């Protein structure tokens, strides 16, 4: 067709027009050495390490920028290419400091590896070296500027991916330097990624400094639970301890980036940890005890009370296995008061249709839209990688963005329609010009954040947004698989809980105050002892001492997300499973194992004994929870719209306000991050200039 034939080392290949020499060499499986080229950043061409010889051409070309020409014959291993690489490595190493034993990049250095592979083995440089002063760009990214090779990757990432123009180059020639020119903190929810993309030890992790070397680390591929995006990560450990968190490439979800909370809150896993079962002594103080005693006390209280009296609240970091185990245990005592801390409207379709509470378009889809409307949510802090995808579409696909809410800074320009929820109705009726804008859009997308749903008028807000979606659908028809309707979540455990039949919100607890309460990692402070009768038996299960721990009668130490193989469902409805990096500390155990042992002690033994059996039970309840990369779903928007049209709950004259108003709020949100000293440093840095 439009393919052209080119040759890499005399071997034919077909490439699309405009393909660079580097990509053509990659088609046959050859990797051209690089320092400044990154396939997710704009092409720079500055390093000059990618220079290659084209047959019958006297001048070497830059493979990362030059488009292949039909009939060209690249020669990646000719004498000219090798001498070019040797000369460029020589110029790169001329002023580089002899820092490898003290550099954190030591065994992970692209400069070191490409020096070993493509450069010479000697120096003929006999002059003094240049040295530059260090920059301070905050508490997360350590800066040692002498090591900089002037690739400019940090500048391109900050400008294009992060949306900030704080980094740059001052001066010129040999003295040219990368920095901010003023005392400025490069603070953003995606900042830590400049450590990954920097090929040298110029930009390093400050929390990670000096602790480990790459060859000793063990790599566990896992998933993040700090939000509802479900970013793929690698947990690096050494001798039973978590060293750091790295991104793992997933094209569909997080690409090769992760947010700063995903990257830097792991140290909170080492603080305020519940390690042994605890009970209240005669004086009403929490004291350590054995597993048997605590389980017997809980089982006694469970046997006495049945049905409505027994209740459970699930927190933000709970997995599907524990959720289904708790659901079965409370069902055996005829209880249906199984709730979450995050409210989703139960009116109409509610949880009956999955399509109703999921981001139907998906993260990948944003790249195929041209108009997006965001209602009552801050995409940047509730889902930083989702906001990164939105900015990528805004930059490369000219995506038009409009927002209804407080004018938060999203790092890209959008249309602020206001903050009054009544505007939604105005859009639904058709009196707003944005109604015409959505009417003519080929791939319109409407996104409603779950945070907006938390307020009392949320059922009304969802009805109005569904009305907007219905108007778009009836005017333009259905193009096929587009799924205009979307719900943006912020809690990792919410989608699986809804998939399991859990009732969203804590309303049923207030309606029917229970005598036995199961706090399963619930630290939101929603239900206190003022909302419960006296002599209420509160059981807390989790890994951190937070809001939910010091108000309990029995404390059961559970495992964090890094210490179990557990299932999480993201905003898209995709199901992923974590892997054990380290075992739980002290006497802590796996959460579903705690629930199963407690069921056995109380006489109503649960049918499952292993993890495969509990995942079979999970499949029995909701079969989509065992498909570990599938995101395909059926659209039931018409039924949900019909069911939503029934009630007509009134809106409020209250401006929509996101909980994460500013950057400081982004850091400490859950119990793991609240226990992190790095997040405390970040909060202190964004509140105090210094």
């Amino acid at each position: 067709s439009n393919l052209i034939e080119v040759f890499v080392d005399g071997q034919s290949v077909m490439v699309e027009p405009g393909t660079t020499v580097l990509q053509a060499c990659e088609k046959v499986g050859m990797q051209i050495p690089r320092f400044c080229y990154h396939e997710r950043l704009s092409v720079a061409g500055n390093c000059r390490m990618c220079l290659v010889e084209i047959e019958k051409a006297p001048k070497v070309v830059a493979a990362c920028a030059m488009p292949v020409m039909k009939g060209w014959n690249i020669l990646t291993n000719s004498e000219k290419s090798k001498k070019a690489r040797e000369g460029v490595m020589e110029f790169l190493l001329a002023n580089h400091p002899l820092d490898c034993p003290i550099c954190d990049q030591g065994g992970e250095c692209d400069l070191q590896d490409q020096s070993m592979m493509f450069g010479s083995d000697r120096s003929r440089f006999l002059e003094g070296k240049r040295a530059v002063e260090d920059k301070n760009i905050g508490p997360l990214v350590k800066t040692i500027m002498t090591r900089c090779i002037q690739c400019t990757r940090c500048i391109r990432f900050a400008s294009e991916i992060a949306g900030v123009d704080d980094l740059g180059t001052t001066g010129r020639g040999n003295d040219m330097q990368v920095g901010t020119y003023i005392e400025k903190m490069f603070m953003s929810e995606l900042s830590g990624n400049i450590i990954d993309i920097c090929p040298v030890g110029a930009l390093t992790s400050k929390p990670y400094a000096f602790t480990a070397r790459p060859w000793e680390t063990r790599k566990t591929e896992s998933i993040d639970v700090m939000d509802a995006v479900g970013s793929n990560i690698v947990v690096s450990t050494r001798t039973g301890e978590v060293m750091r968190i790295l991104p793992r490439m997933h094209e569909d979800i997080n690409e090769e980036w992760i947010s700063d909370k995903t990257r830097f809150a792991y140290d909170g896993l080492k603080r305020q940890r519940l390690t042994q079962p605890m009970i209240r002594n005669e004086k009403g103080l929490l004291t350590y005890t054995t597993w048997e005693d605590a389980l017997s006390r809980v089982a006694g209280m469970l046997q006495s009370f049945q049905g409505n009296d027994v209740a459970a609240i699930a927190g933000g970091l709970v997995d599907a296995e524990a959720l289904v185990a708790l659901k079965d245990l409370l069902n055996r005592v005829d209880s249906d008061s199984l709730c979450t801390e995050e409210v989703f409207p139960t009116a109409g379709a509610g949880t009956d249709l999955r399509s109703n509470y999921l981001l139907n378009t998906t993260i990948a889809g944003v790249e195929e839209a041209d108009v997006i409307l965001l209602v009552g949510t801050n995409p940047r802090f509730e889902a930083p990688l989702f906001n990164a995808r939105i900015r990528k579409s805004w930059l490369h696909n000219d995506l038009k963005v409009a927002l209804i809410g407080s004018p938060v800074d999203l790092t890209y320009r959008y249309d602020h329609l206001g903050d009054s929820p009544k505007i939604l109705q105005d859009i639904a009726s058709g009196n707003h010009p944005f109604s015409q804008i959505l009417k003519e859009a080929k791939k319109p997308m409407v996104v409603l954040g779950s945070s907006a749903l938390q307020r009392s008028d949320g059922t009304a807000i969802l009805a109005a947004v569904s009305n907007i979606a219905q108007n778009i659908r009836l005017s333009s028809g259905v193009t096929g698989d587009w799924k205009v309707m979307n719900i943006l979540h912020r809690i990792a455990s919410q989608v699986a809980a809804l998939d399991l039949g859990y009732k969203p919100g804590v309303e049923a607890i207030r309606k029917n105050p229970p005598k036995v309460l199961f706090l399963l990692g619930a630290d939101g402070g929603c239900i206190t002892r003022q909302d419960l009768p006296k002599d209420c038996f509160i059981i807390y299960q989790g890994h951190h001492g937070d809001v939910g721990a010091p108000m309990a009668d029995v404390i059961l130490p559970g495992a964090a997300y890094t210490e179990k193989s557990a299932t999480y469902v993201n905003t898209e409805g995709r199901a992923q499973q974590t892997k054990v990096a380290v075992t739980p500390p002290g006497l802590a155990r796996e959460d579903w194992k705690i629930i199963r042992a407690l069921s056995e002690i109380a006489g109503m033994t649960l049918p499952y004994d292993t993890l495969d059996q509990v995942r079979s039970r999970l499949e029995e309840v909701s079969p989509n929870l065992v498909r570990y990369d599938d995101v395909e779903g059926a659209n039931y928007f018409q039924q949900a719209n019909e069911l939503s049209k029934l009630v007509n709950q009134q809106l409020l004259a209250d401006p929509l306000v996101p909980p994460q108003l500013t950057i400081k709020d982004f850091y400490m949100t859950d119990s793991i991050s609240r226990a992190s000293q790095t997040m405390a440093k970040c909060v202190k840095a964004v509140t105090e200039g210094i």
Binding site: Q272, R273, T275
Partner: protein
Amino acid sequence: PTTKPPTARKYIWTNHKFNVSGTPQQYVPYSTTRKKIQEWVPPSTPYK
């Protein structure tokens, strides 16, 4: 050493010790690192 004395440093031992094995001055190995996981401290006040 009388005609070629060693270089003087202030951290070099001024008093040589012999093999002190099998003696209350013997070396006993131990871990030199600090505690890794800190446990939650329950509050000292009653909850009701």
